[PDB]
Amino acid sequence: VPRVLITGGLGQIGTDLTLALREKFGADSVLTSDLVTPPEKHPLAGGKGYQHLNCMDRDAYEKLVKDFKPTWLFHLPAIMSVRGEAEPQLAMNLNINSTRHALDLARDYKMRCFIPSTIAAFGDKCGKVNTKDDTILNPSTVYGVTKVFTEMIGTYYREKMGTDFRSVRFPGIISAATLPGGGATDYAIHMYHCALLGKKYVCPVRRDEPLPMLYMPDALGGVIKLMEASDSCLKRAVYNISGFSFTPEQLRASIEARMKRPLEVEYVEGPAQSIAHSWPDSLDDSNARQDWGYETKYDVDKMTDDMLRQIPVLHGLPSL
Amino acid sequence: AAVPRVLITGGLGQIGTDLTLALREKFGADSVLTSDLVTPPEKHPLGYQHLNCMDRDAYEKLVKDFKPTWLFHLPAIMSVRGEAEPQLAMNLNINSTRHALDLARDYKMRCFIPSTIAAFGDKCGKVNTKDDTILNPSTVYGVTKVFTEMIGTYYREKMGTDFRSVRFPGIISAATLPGGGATDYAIHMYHCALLGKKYVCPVRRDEPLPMLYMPDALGGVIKLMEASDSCLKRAVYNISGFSFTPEQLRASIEARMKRPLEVEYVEGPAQSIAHSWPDSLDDSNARQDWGYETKYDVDKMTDDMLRQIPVLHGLPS
Ligand SMILES: NC(=O)c1ccc[n+]([C@@H]2O[C@H](COP(=O)([O-])OP(=O)(O)OC[C@H]3O[C@@H](n4cnc5c(N)ncnc54)[C@H](O)[C@@H]3O)[C@@H](O)[C@H]2O)c1
Ligand SMILES: NC(=O)c1ccc[n+]([C@@H]2O[C@H](COP(=O)([O-])OP(=O)(O)OC[C@H]3O[C@@H](n4cnc5c(N)ncnc54)[C@H](O)[C@@H]3O)[C@@H](O)[C@H]2O)c1
Ligand SMILES: [K+]
Ligand SMILES: [K+]
């Protein structure tokens, strides 16, 4: 089995990925690291197999890599769309420089190295319907700019520096564990919570604005399957992967169908809209399907049923 | 009062040298300050100030002291060097660019940072390559220049910064020798023809590349920098001069000197890089938006180069 190091591992993806890999390869084979100490209530709090690491600190990163001798590296820290627009300097510092450190370390310590990209790599010239893997990239966010960098330098390391870098363009990832906040694609989790509370929701994304989205189990399944794939099957370094595409109105309909009662939504455009409009409406993921057998288990209604069952248990909202 | 106050960084290299001279002639010597990491060699053509653009405080100090209205940020590690020294290429080409853009934003400068055909890779559509296409550069240099284009565009769009750029072809000039490696064969071939010695060419005999003679390159950059914001529909523009292969340039030189030139093709790293680059470029946006034009065809460039190199470098006529 692999020895796995995850960095930025206390966040939305890192937490679930830590859990899934421990269950698949055993607890002792996974070390999770993060800038910050796990909060008291955090699923990974107090567990063995946690170490602090600021990925901006190259010596500290190398030290932990030499200590633990991982064979797989999941480099997850980045500043995303909304926070990046407000703190562009931080976004560039983290998204560019930590990326460089991860790649240099995967090279020299011969690790299989996953650094996720995002649909934010795309802009309004991408060809928004069934967006291809190879297209025009003109991201409108600093985040997206840094993620184009990540893709291109990672690909360069794969082609010219003998480094086993692997990546997907994630759509927005939905999870029952996440507290709704100010994120570009957070409206969906807000909708599910408001449905359960029976409260009105003010949505900042336009009512008919479609986005590619992905349910957390399908995302984790895809990452793990990509990381297990034979190099011989990987015709490219970066793959689009998709779950489904929906608009706020569509998600609302899925929720109302499941609950058999109305969800009250009011559409007031927020900062998320301008970001969302600049992203694809849907993704073409045929290359991931063909090369390495990417697939998904959840459609929208199945995600909606799962979310409405999980949220009451995980957060203590009213159950259906 | 309408005359631009110009700061050039990385100014002692191939482009900076001729750009400084062109701007002094256009606007007066007092209006241009050139700066570089290294100090001017004895026989260097070059109004000078030392500046390491990696030192952000020093860069800000010079900007605050001189108060330029135009900034030309020229330092970068180019294709061939960048393959050998990827760390340095990434440090300089990413971080010095960041410094330039932040200073151009805060001190309200019109900010030129050049890109290159090296931003393209083998998926760009090699014939008449468009401004908007797939970018898959094969060099770390090209990766850093896509970054440059994308972050500069982001600053123009969202950070109120007057960032302007062109994708330069291979630039040919008689004065300062090139630093880049890849398209340098053209200049080397002229020198060899004049010395009457055999040239060893690292690029495949029939590999076409976009090239551009320095006066057209500079005329274009200057015209872009003079353009109103209103006519600029994009931040980054392909500009083109001509497209040729090594053997076509060999023929141009031979026709002008009326004697043969010995060339031996030994395909090296430069060929792999060159083959990933466009064969020719589409510059219709630059022509449409701000009136880009050129005056030199290959024959005229050849005529100029063979007459100018001996005068500047004391080679035989
Ligand atoms: N969640 C999504 O929908 C989504 C979509 C596309 C791409 N992605 C990519 O997935 C990755 C992880 O996303 P996420 O939602 O889990 O992020 P998150 O914000 O939930 O967590 C990121 C983690 O990085 C840590 N971190 C920040 N700076 C650090 C540093 N200097 N050193 C070490 N750790 C540091 C944070 O403390 C945090 O625990 C990012 O690269 C992101 O761009 C996520
Ligand atoms: N010449 C070409 O054909 C060509 C083609 C495409 C794009 N470009 C771009 O034009 C720009 C200038 O190219 P060039 O051919 O004049 O390069 P050059 O190598 O001839 O000159 C680069 C100059 O930058 C200086 N420099 C390096 N590090 C520095 C630092 N830290 N601070 C300050 N100065 C520093 C060097 O000392 C040198 O004088 C580069 O961005 C290059 O990518 C050039
Ligand atoms: K969209
Ligand atoms: K070519």
Numbering used by the authors:
A (entry chain A): 13 to 332
B (entry chain B): 11 to 56, 61 to 331
From the paper:
In this parasite, threonine degradation pathway occurs within the mitochondrion, where the amino acid is initially oxidized to 2-amino-3-ketobutyrate (AKB) by a NAD+ dependent L-threonine dehydrogenase (TDH, 1.1.1.103) and then cleaved into glycine and acetyl-CoA by a 2-amino-3-ketobutyrate coenzyme A ligase (AKCL, 2.3.1.29). Finally, we report the crystal structure of TcTDH and characterize its allosteric activation by potassium. The tertiary structure of TcTDH comprises two domains composed of alternating protein segments. The cofactor-binding domain adopts a characteristic Rossman motif and contains both catalytic residues, Thr-130 and Tyr-155.
Crystallographic structures of recombinant TcTDH without natural ligands (apo-TcTDH) and in complex with NAD+ and acetate (holo-TcTDH) were determined and refined to 2.1 and 1.73 Å resolution, respectively. In both crystals, asymmetric units (ASU) comprise two polypeptide chains, related by a non-crystallographic symmetry two-fold axis. The two protomers in ASU correspond to the homodimeric biological unit. For the holo-TcTDH, the initial 12 residues from chain A and the initial 10 residues from chain B were omitted. In chain B, residues 57 to 60 and the terminal residue from the C-terminus were excluded from the final model. The catalytic domain exhibits a α+β fold and regulates access to the catalytic site through displacement of Loop-1 (residues 190–194), which is observed in open and closed conformations in chains A and B of the holo-TcTDH structure, respectively. The potassium-binding site is situated opposite to the catalytic site. In TcTDH, K+ is observed in octahedral coordination established through interactions with residues in the catalytic domain (Glu-221, Pro-222, and Ala-288) and cofactor-binding domain (Trp-291, Pro-292, and Asp-293). Four interactions are established between K+ and the main chain carbonyl of Pro-222, Ala-288, Trp-291, and Pro-292, and two interactions with the side chain carboxyl of Glu-221 and Asp-293. Indeed, our results confirmed that TcTDH is activated by K+ and to a lesser extent by NH4+.
